[PDB]
A paper describes a structure:
To test whether the three substitutions of Omicron (S371L, S373P, and S375F) are critical for its stable one-RBD-up conformation, we generated Omicron-S-L371S/P373S/F375S mutant protein with the three residues (L371, P373, and F375) replaced by those (S371, S373, and S375) in the prototypic spike. The purified mutant protein was incubated with hACE2 in the same way to determine the cryo-EM structure. Strikingly, the structure revealed that the mutant spike predominantly exists in the three-RBD-up conformation after ACE2 binding, indicating that these three reverse mutations prime to transform into open conformation when bound to the ACE2 receptor. In addition, the three-RBD-up conformation of hACE2-bound mutant Omicron spike with reverse mutations (L371S, P373S and F375S) reveals the three emerging substitutions of Omicron (S371L, S373P, and S375F) play a crucial role in stabling the one-RBD-up conformation of the spike to fight against the conformational alteration triggered by ACE2 binding. Furthermore, we found that S371L, S373P and S375F substitutions enhance the stability of the one-RBD-up conformation to prevent exposing more up-RBDs triggered by ACE2 binding.
As the spike glycoprotein of SARS-CoV-2 mediates the virus entry into host cells, it is the main target of NAbs and the hotspot for designing therapeutic agents and vaccines. Omicron carries the most significant number of mutations among all SARS-CoV-2 variants to date, with 37 mutations within its spike protein, 15 of which are positioned at the RBD and cover almost all the critical mutation sites carried by previous VOCs, such as K417N, S477N, E484K (E484A in Omicron), and N501Y. The Omicron spike has 37 mutation sites, 11 located on the N-terminal domain (NTD), 15 on the RBD, and the remaining 11 near the furin cleavage site and on the S2 subunit. To delineate the impact of emerging mutations on spike’s properties, we performed systematic structural analyses on apo Omicron spike and its complexes with human ACE2 or S309 neutralizing antibody (NAb) by cryo-EM.
Numbering used by the authors:
A (entry chain B): 712 to 827, 845 to 1147
B (entry chain A): 613 to 620, 641 to 676, 690 to 711
C (entry chain C): 861 to 1058
D (entry chain C): 712 to 760
The structure:
C-alpha cells in the first residue's frame, strides 16, 4: 500500500457566462426608414412584427431572470467585522476595497479591466433601428450580492444557507471541513500556520496568474464577439439588391414607373423580412445555450459556495474544501480551494489480525507495518498507533480470512488491574 | 426609451425619460421593473419611482471564541 | 471531415482509465496515484455503501463468482437484442437522411420551367434567364439555410448529451457516488468505461 | 420489520452518444455547378457563404 505523509492546499479558477446583451429592433425604419411608400405597402403583408417583438422581449426578460436567479440567493445583507483577524488567514485580496469609489475588490477590478471626431460602432448600429436596453441590476448591486455572500460564508460557514446565521471561529470551521473530507481535526490544529501560509501563497499565485496572462477569459469575449458579428451581418444585409435593380429605394421610385417599382419593393420587403426572421432564430438558439450555462452556474453556486460537496471533480480538482465567488462582465468566476496529498510512502498491510484465536478488523483506519511492528492508521494521512481493543472489533476465528497475520492485541485494562 | 427628454413630472433616467411618476428617496422591493436599478410602484393613490433595495441589513457578531 | 482523435487513441484512453481504477482505486482522480490490493478496495467500497468490512472478507469467493458470471452474461446479452444500440444508429440515420434530402432537393423546379442551367441559357434569352436564375438561386439558398438551422439544433442536442456523459464519467468512474439511480439501479459499487463508434 | 440475509452483484449497461459527423459545403459547387456565368451573376447577390 501507499500512504501520504504531507498535504497541499490548492486554488483553482472557473469562469462561467451568465447573461447576454438585450436588443430591440424597429421594423419599419430598418426596412425602409422614412419612405411613405413602404409605410403603406408593408401593411398588406399582415403583421410579421408582433411575434418578432414578442420573441425579443422574451429573450430580454429571460436575461434578467437568469442574472437574478444566479446572484440573488441571500435574504439579508451581511457585513464583515471591522477587525480582519481570522486565525491567520488573509482574505484581504477578495474582500471589497473601501478606498475605491466603486467598492470592488482587488481581483474583480482585474476582471473588469481585462474584458473590453469619428463615429462609434454602437451609434452607427443605433442609427439603423437596433437599440440596446440596459440591464435591470447595476454592477454595484451585483458587487453587493457578492460581498454579502463572501461575508456570510466567512463568518458563519454553511449555516446561513439553511436557516438562521450562526457564527463560529474560522479555525473550528476549517476543522469541521477537514473532518468532512475524512481527516481528523488534530491535523489542522497542529498545522494551522503551514495551512494558512499555503493558502496565502495560493491566493497570491492566482493574483499573478490572472494578472499576467490575458487570454483566460475566452468565453465571455466569444459571446460578445458572436453578438457583434450577428449585428454587423444584419447591418451589412441592407446594402444588397435582393434581385432588384438597385438597393437604394428613392432611385427605384424616381427612375421607373410605379408598376415595376411595386415588384422591386416587394422583392426588397421579402428579402429584409427573411433576414430579420433568420436573425431572430439565431438569437433564440443562442439564448437557449446561455440559459443552459446560467442554470449550471446557479447550481454550482448553490452546491459549492453554500455548502461542501462530495461530488467528484465538480467544485475543483481534488478534495473540495470551500469556494469563493466573484463577478465579471456577463459572468461569474469561482475560486475553489481544495486539498491534495503528497509525499507518499510504501507499507505492507494485512486484512485482519489473528490474536488469541480470534480475527480482528480495524474500526476506522487500516493496518500497516514498518517492516518489524504493526500499527493502525487513518487512510488519508500517516499517523501510526498501537493496536488495542479500543480501535478494533472482533468477529469469528482466524481460519477463514485470506492473508491474515498473527501479532498481538494490547488490552489497556489489565495493567490497571495488576496495579 | 433612450431619449433625452429635454428634446422630447419628468425624470431623466439611464433608460430614457419617465413622465407621470414622482421620484422619492426611500427604498422598497421592486414591484414594476423599469431598468438600471430603478423600479416603479403605485403607492401612497400615486405612482412613484425609486431605487431597488437588496433585502434587509444584518451583521453577525464574530469573535475568537464565541 | 475526419475526427481529430483516431479510435486507437480513444481505446488507449479507456485502457488507461481501466488500469488506473483497477490498480489504484479512486486516488488517481484526486492527486497522486496510490496502490492498494483489490480486495481491500472492495472492502472500502462495501464500507462506503453501509456494510461492515468482514462481510466481504468472509465471502470473497462467492462475490468473485457472481461478478464473473455477470461479466459472462452481459456479452451474450449484447449479442442478441439489436435494439440496445438504437441511439447511435438513430443519430447516423438522421444525419444521412438530412444529407440525402439536401442532395435530392436540387432536382426541384422551384416554379421555373427546368432545373438545368445550360438548357435555359442556350435555349432562352438572357432577360428571362435573369428571373429563372433568380428563382433557382432563391430556392437553393433557402434549402441551404434550412439545412444549417437543423444542423445547429442537432449539434446543441448532441452537446447536451456529451455534457451528461462527461459528468457520468467523472462521477461514477473516478469515484463512488451516493446519488440514487445515477450510476445504475441499486447501491453503486463501481463502473467501467468502453468506447463505441461516436 | 424486514431484514435481508443475502445479496447479489449486478452489472448494468448504459449507452451515451458523444459526437456527430463533421460536414462542409461549397456555395458555387452546390448552387451553380460548372457554369461560370451563374457564378458571375451569383457573386452580385450576397455573402451568405
Ligand atoms: C510538508 O510540506 C511543507 C511545505 O514544503 C514542509 O514545510 C517546509 O519545511 C521546511 C523545513 O524542512 C521549511 O524550510 C519550508 O519553508 C517549509 N515550507 C513552507 C511552505 O513553510 C513540511 O515540512 C512538510 N512536512 C513534512 C512532514 O515533511
Ligand atoms: C494580506 O495580504 C495583503 C496583500 O497581499 C498584504 O498587503 C501588503 O502589505 C504590505 C505592507 O507590509 C505592502 O508592502 C504590500 O504592498 C501589500 N500587498 C499588496 C499586494 O499591495 C497584507 O499585509 C497581508 N496581511 C494582512 C494582515 O492584511
Ligand atoms: C518501526 O517503528 C517502531 C516504533 O515506531 C520502531 O521501534 C523503535 O525504534 C527506535 C529506533 O529509533 C528504538 O529506539 C526503539 O527502542 C524501538 N521500540 C521498540 C519497542 O522496539 C522500529 O525501530 C521501527 N522499525 C524500523 C524503523 O525499521
Ligand atoms: C499464527 O500462530 C498460530 C499459533 O501459534 C499458528 O497456528 C499453528 O499452525 C501450525 C501449522 O500452520 C499448526 O501445526 C499449529 O498446531 C497451529 N497452532 C495453533 C495454536 O493453532 C499459525 O500458523 C500462525 N499464523 C501463520 C500465518 O503462520
Ligand atoms: C482575537 O485575537 C486577535 C489576535 O490576537 C486580536 O487581535 C489583536 O488585538 C490587539 C488589540 O487591538 C492588537 O494589539 C494585536 O495586534 C491584534 N493581533 C494581531 C495579530 O494584529 C483580537 O483583538 C482578538 N479579539 C477578541 C474579541 O478577543
Ligand atoms: C446466497 O446466494 C448465493 C448465490 O446467489 C448462494 O450460493 C449458492 O448456494 C447453492 C447451495 O449451496 C449452490 O448450489 C450454488 O452453486 C451457490 N451459487 C454460487 C454462485 O456459488 C447462497 O447459498 C445463498 N445463501 C447464502 C447464505 O449465502
Ligand atoms: C514502492 O515499491 C516499488 C517497488 O519497486 C517502487 O517502485 C516504488 O517507488 C516504491 N514507492 C515509493 C514511493 O518509492
Ligand atoms: C440631456 O440634454 C441636456 C441639455 O443639452 C444635457 O445637459 C444633458 O447632459 C443631456 N443628458 C443626456 C443623458 O444626454
Amino acid at each position: 500500500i501507499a500512504i501520504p505523509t504531507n498535504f497541499t492546499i490548492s486554488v483553482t479558477t472557473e469562469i462561467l457566462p451568465v447573461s447576454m446583451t438585450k436588443t430591440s429592433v424597429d421594423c419599419t425604419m430598418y426596412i425602409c426608414g422614412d419612405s411613405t411608400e413602404c409605410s403603406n405597402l408593408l401593411l398588406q403583408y399582415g403583421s410579421f412584427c408582433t411575434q418578432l417583438k414578442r420573441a425579443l422581449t422574451g429573450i430580454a426578460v429571460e436575461q434578467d431572470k437568469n442574472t437574478q436567479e444566479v446572484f440573488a440567493q441571500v435574504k439579508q445583507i451581511y457585513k464583515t467585522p471591522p477587525i480582519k483577524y481570522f486565525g491567520g488567514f488573509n482574505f484581504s485580496q477578495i474582500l471589497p476595497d473601501p478606498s475605491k469609489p466603486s467598492k470592488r475588490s482587488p481581483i474583480e477590478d482585474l476582471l473588469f479591466n481585462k474584458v473590453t471626431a469619428a463615429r462609434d460602432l454602437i451609434c452607427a448600429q443605433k442609427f439603423k433601428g437596433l437599440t440596446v436596453l440596459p440591464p435591470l441590476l447595476t454592477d454595484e448591486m451585483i458587487a453587493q450580492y457578492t460581498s454579502a455572500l463572501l461575508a456570510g460564508t466567512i463568518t458563519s460557514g454553511w449555516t446561513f444557507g439553511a436557516g438562521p446565521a450562526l457564527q463560529i471561529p474560522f479555525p473550528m470551521q476549517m476543522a469541521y471541513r477537514f473532518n468532512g473530507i475524512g481527516v481528523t481535526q488534530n491535523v489542522l490544529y497542529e498545522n494551522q500556520k503551514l495551512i494558512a501560509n499555503q493558502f496565502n501563497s495560493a491566493i497570491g499565485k492566482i493574483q499573478d496568474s490572472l494578472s499576467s496572462t490575458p487570454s483566460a477569459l475566452g468565453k465571455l469575449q466569444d459571446v460578445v464577439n458572436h453578438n457583434a458579428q450577428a449585428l454587423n451581418t444584419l447591418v451589412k444585409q441592407l446594402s444588397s439588391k435582393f434581385g432588384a435593380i438597385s438597393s437604394v429605394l428613392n432611385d427605384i421610385f424616381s427612375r421607373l414607373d410605379p408598376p415595376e417599382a411595386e415588384v422591386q419593393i416587394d422583392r426588397l420587403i421579402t428579402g429584409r423580412l427573411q433576414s430579420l426572421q433568420t436573425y431572430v432564430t439565431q438569437q433564440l438558439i443562442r439564448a437557449a445555450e446561455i440559459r443552459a450555462s446560467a442554470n449550471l452556474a446557479a447550481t454550482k453556486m448553490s452546491e459549492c459556495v453554500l455548502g461542501q460537496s462530495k461530488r467528484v471533480d465538480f467544485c475543483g480538482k481534488g478534495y473540495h474544501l470551500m469556494s469563493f465567488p466573484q463577478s465579471a462582465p456577463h459572468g461569474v468566476v469561482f475560486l475553489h480551494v481544495t486539498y491534495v496529498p503528497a509525499q507518499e510512502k510504501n507499507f505492507t498491510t494485512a486484512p485482519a489480525i489473528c490474536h488469541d484465536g480470534k480475527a480482528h478488523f480495524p474500526r476506522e483506519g487500516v493496518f500497516v507495518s514498518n517492516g518489524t511492528h504493526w500499527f493502525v492508521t487513518q487512510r488519508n494521512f500517516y499517523e501510526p498507533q498501537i493496536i488495542t481493543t479500543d480501535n478494533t472489533f472482533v468477529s469469528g476465528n482466524c481460519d477463514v480470512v485470506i492473508g491474515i497475520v498473527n501479532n498481538t492485541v494490547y488490552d489497556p485494562l489489565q495493567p490497571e488491574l495488576d496495579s | 426609451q433612450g431619449v433625452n427628454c429635454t428634446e422630447v413630472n419628468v425624470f431623466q433616467t439611464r433608460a430614457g425619460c419617465l413622465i407621470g411618476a414622482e421620484y422619492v428617496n426611500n427604498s422598497y422591493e421592486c414591484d414594476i421593473p423599469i431598468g438600471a436599478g430603478i423600479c416603479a410602484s403605485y403607492q401612497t393613490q400615486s405612482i412613484i419611482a425609486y431605487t431597488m433595495s437588496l433585502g434587509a441589513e444584518n451583521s453577525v457578531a464574530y469573535s475568537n471564541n464565541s
